[PDB]
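Ticket #4471: complex job returned nothing on first submit. Input attached below:
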Amino acid sequence: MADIQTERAYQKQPTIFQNKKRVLLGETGKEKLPRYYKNIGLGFKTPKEAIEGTYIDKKCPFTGNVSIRGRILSGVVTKMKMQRTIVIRRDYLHYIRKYNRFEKRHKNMSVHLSPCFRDVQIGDIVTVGECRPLSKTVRFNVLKVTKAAGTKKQFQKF
Amino acid sequence: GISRDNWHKRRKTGGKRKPYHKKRKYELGRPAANTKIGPRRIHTVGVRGGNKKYRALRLDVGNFSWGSECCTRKTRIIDVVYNASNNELVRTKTLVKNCIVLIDSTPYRQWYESHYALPLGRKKGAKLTPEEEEILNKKRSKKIQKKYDERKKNAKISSLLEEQFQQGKLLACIASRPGQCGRADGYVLEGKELEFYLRKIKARKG
Amino acid sequence: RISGGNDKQGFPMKQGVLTHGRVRLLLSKGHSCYRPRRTGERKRKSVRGCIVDANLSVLNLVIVKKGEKDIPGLTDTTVTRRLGPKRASRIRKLFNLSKE
Amino acid sequence: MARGPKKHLKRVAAPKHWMLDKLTSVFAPRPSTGPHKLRECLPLIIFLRNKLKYALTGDEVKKICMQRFIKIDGKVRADITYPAGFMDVISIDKTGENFRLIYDTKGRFAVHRITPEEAKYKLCKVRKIFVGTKGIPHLVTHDARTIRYPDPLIKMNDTIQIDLETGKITDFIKFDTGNLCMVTGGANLGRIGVITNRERHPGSFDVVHVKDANGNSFATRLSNIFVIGKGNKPWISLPRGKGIRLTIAEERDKRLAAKQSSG
RNA sequence: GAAACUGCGAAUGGCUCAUUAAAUCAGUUAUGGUUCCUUUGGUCGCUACUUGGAUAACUGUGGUAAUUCUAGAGCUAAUACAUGCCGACGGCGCUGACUCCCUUUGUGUGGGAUGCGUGCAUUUAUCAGAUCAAAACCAACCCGGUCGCGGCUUUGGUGACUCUAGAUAACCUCGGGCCGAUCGCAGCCCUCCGUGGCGGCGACGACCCAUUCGAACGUCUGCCCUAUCAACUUUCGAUGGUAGUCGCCGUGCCUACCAUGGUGACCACGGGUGACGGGGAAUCAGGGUUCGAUUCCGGAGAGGGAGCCUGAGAAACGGCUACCACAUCCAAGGAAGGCAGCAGGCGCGCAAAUUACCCACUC
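Support reply: We reran it on our side without changes. The output follows.
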């Protein structure tokens, strides 16, 4: 919040510039930084916390340098010990045709999760879309979070 | 020789993989430019598709922008003072993208003093009056002093730059890739970027 | 003037190899002592250094200044007809012709 | 290994609609690089040797072309494997005849003779719209033609008419409901009908629904629809059978009843 | 019209199945993360009536036991190699000596001597991108009118761009971006007697868009036997973050600093395979079992490993350099080599054809 330059190099959004002319503000002041953000398409909506926020993240869909294309998928949040990335589980049934019966299977995906989502928990349901390769094992990025079709965080009044 | 392939290294599970084929030519890599400060030395290489690429080994001069004033000019490069990635690059004086450098203030000072009709880099009267006062004051029929309110009411520079101009050097940041373009070229440090790197420079050695 | 020669075993001398021995060099298009059979070909082959010794099969020499005496046949014989020029400015330069 | 581009074609690998025999040979003509895709063209040698039968061998085709008799879109072509395709005109001024390439309702090029005043124009589908330097607008067609200064009402998926002596636009048809079209790919290849609905998806493929003269209904991806007339009437003459695609039982019954094929 | 120089092709075709178990391969999708000879269509006006020197074929003299080995001497060309005008600057922005009019300045004007930059590509920085709901005061005015009221305007496109087009300040590659010192057929029209040109048909060539043929990298789901294989990976990069280098481009691809991650009983990690994958083949009431080196499609490799030149395209073997294993000739100094192409031979073994004829057909 109050400080974000925790790295050895200065952190800023590309395409935003601050004028060093007409700088007078009197006894008070206003934000020296305007905010860059965009529409993703496909009927998704940009979070309020991306527009009203102050974080820097170049891999963010709403406020960074990525294009959402190809497949849209969903899965269950299962681990989150990395920084700005999480692991999700996908479960399915496989048909074996000699018998007339099914077999249970799973796979894991590592995905990139930006700030603007900040109340996610293990067992939440998440929707993701493809990007260019973002790191060695990461190809997908979080577009929406939900806990519909399941029990509450704490008691039923949540 | 050198190569940039994905298949020489292990998978998500920690398991090995065996080679699928010999090294291909499209997987190639080459040694680094390691560009120094010094009089121009550039070499050229042929690249995939028959195109050409330029590699700078020595550079003495660059193009820099003072974005606050919409002024850009060809300028001498003096020294390197900070590098976010590795300290051996400033100890050996190597020039790369987002490196922090010192540049000659003169062509910006000459543009400002002739545009605003005011002094900038001056200490005392002995470096104002004896020559070049005729840049500042001349006959100007119905353009003499009050019509320069279009200039004078917006002339004041930031205190952090007025302290740099008196020493004859400005801090700047490299924006081009010199080992790929053959050019060293960028912008003058200002505002909170200038406060950030002045704190980092002082906290390292001072 | 000394213009070159051949070793025993017939290997040629070439300029810039500063020894009395023979050596093996990787030759390429534009060097003497090699003629490429394909575009971009290079081959490694034996050549003799620049220094003259008793070992040579033959020395090549060219007369750069004549004496007062005549050497039999070699300096008696008058010049042949050669072949004339073919580029237009070359013809003008030979006969001192005007531009018109 | 594959160290560069290929330059042969095996006869069992060649496009099915050319109707090549099994036993004369191992190879087929590789179509010359050009305005139409390798799967979607007819090489000029297959038209002169196998369809029109003016030549018995590839050498008899070579010595027809080198005499400068054959024109495609009004230009003389000496290349025997040149890739002719949909809506092109071929003219043979020495025999006095003109042709246009159009699909038969079984999904293959028909021979279709035309009158010399209809041999003066062709129909083109729009692929791209863009702006170049100095703000000049550009158009691109299904057959690689580039046009400067198009009419600002001409949009994506529309059909334009061009005169062949000058290469400039004369008139156009908008893509909208109720216009006549022909199908140029998939299983419905070579059918004709009116556009009746367009269903759209953001990402992936749009789908068009089309209605027949006999009241049948069929659908395809939007990339397979070519518009050929404003409302009910086409801007080009059409081959025997007019795109109606009768079933194998109707085709049996007409073949018995009409006694055609020298019965 | 021999030879020779220059251009293009030789990266396709043909042969084999050793390696290879989420690898290859199949169906399905993506480049809004790249490159692209040729074809086809756009585009092609910021000494000059024609420049420079120098080699091959050829002529002439040689060296070595020996090879598609080559040296010294005398001549001469270009669409090879290297220079460089003319024509059509008349741009439009910025400076502003002076000058004229209402109002000494400021502020509204119209002229204007004189300088500087001024095509498309290239590197970096900055600017603008127009549209929506409702009134009331004040400075100064567009405009209909005069000393307070009506009424408005400006590239294109996608589901989505830090897209395309536009404006400003500089850079620029040079020896190291473009804008023709080239070749062949028929001749012409004239302040016109062989002159000023303008012009008909082409041929070849080159920077940049778009095509065509592709190539490369990535998404989702799919595999034979094994526990006498239960835990594995990890600055010797393992999983992730920030900045950079290198590369045609995305990316631990690699480097510095930091974090402590990632996979497994829904079988990881390890071992085996007389394992190249698929279209397919034999047998078969219904359900199945077994096979697929082999004419079509994809991959890999030219005795074994490694390195590299040329080019749009190769880590090429009918290209080159070296080590390792074989092996031919010699005057013992040296030189030359790769049939898993077609015929043919030896060895192996139960086990497999002629050292024939032709470009007539298909390409």
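The first helix of chain B runs from residue 88 to 91. Closing as resolved unless it happens again.
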